Amino acid sequence: GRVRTKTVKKAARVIIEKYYTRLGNDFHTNKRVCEEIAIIPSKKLRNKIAGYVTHLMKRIQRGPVRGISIKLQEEERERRDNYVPEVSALDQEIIEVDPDTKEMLKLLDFGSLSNLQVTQPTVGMNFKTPRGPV
Amino acid sequence: TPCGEGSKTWDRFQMRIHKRLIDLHSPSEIVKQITSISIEPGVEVEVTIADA
Amino acid sequence: GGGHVAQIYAIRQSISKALVAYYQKYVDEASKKEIKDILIQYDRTLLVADPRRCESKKFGGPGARARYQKSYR
């Protein structure tokens, strides 16, 4: 009998989007911010919106919820763009191939242009997983 | 219901009427210029007879 | 107000919390907390008012919940 309706949830996700720096993990202060910054037409859904606002205060300070607010979003510009490594994941200059794929680059005239020490395929033909339910 | 058919339903109409009261030590001539400052159709104001 | 039984619960509540609000004002709350220690663990209702009330009648029965007897045949 607790479960909050659409108009309470959609009006509280628009608060936390747009006034996130002015909020906190207390109920009685967030009740007063939304009182002063949003036109609520009664007292009952006022603090019922403010309840779900504080519910999202602890919810998004633990991680990236559907959270288009600035600070959680600008911090992932230091993940997609930052961590470019000082040494590459590609440039190791010691990489392995197989005797058939070196024949592929042999007609590409890249046989001796490369270093490319080879590994051999372990000779079984044990692919194509066994059939039937057990 | 406008007849006897139905399921024994009843509607409950009510009219709450309010009443307030104020004494004054006023002269009975300036009472009218306190009376002539509101139109306010939904009230009913009465002034007590001056003999007290 | 009330009845023969609802008044002696009300005066029981009254004289129990009257000296509590006397002791929170004219002596310290250290004595008050010591005696409200007694008057809470033993049946809390000596200084809190019981909220439940008359719970009005409806238009289909003799009381508020029950109904008149339904007949079919």
């Binding site: 108009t7 009006a11 949003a38 036109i39 609520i40 037409p41 859904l45 | - | -």
Partner: protein, 113 residues
């Protein structure tokens, strides 16, 4: 009954109405009565705000056969805060205000006035 109801349904909605619906019931073309209703817009039905956001008017039309029944109701807009529409906005929606662009939060600068 179909030409007359459209001219009135077009006329409420062009006067600035949040929604309206008209029901005309009676002996139409045919000997058994039926009801043509011509709903439009949004209209609330339950609660107390359908006491002052709506006005209802039920009238009768005495024709040569039977009697028709007109039933018109308009849902009134909140906007004017004045003559044509009510105050006290609809209780299930929230008007949030947009904040300002938040210039000068940076490094300190002091004046004397």
């Amino acid at each position: 009954v179909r030409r007359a109801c459209y001219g009135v349904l077009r006329f409420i909605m062009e006067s600035g109405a949040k929604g309206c619906e008209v029901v005309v019931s009676g002996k139409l073309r045919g000997q058994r009565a039926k009801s043509m209703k011509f709903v439009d817009g949004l209209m609330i039905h339950s609660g107390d705000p359908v006491n002052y956001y709506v006005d209802t008017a039920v009238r009768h039309v005495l024709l040569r056969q039977g009697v028709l029944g007109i039933k018109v109701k308009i849902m009134l807009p909140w906007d004017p805060t004045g003559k044509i529409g009510p105050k006290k906005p609809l209780p299930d929606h929230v008007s949030i205000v947009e904040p300002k662009d938040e210039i000068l939060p940076t490094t300190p600068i002091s004046e004397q006035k």
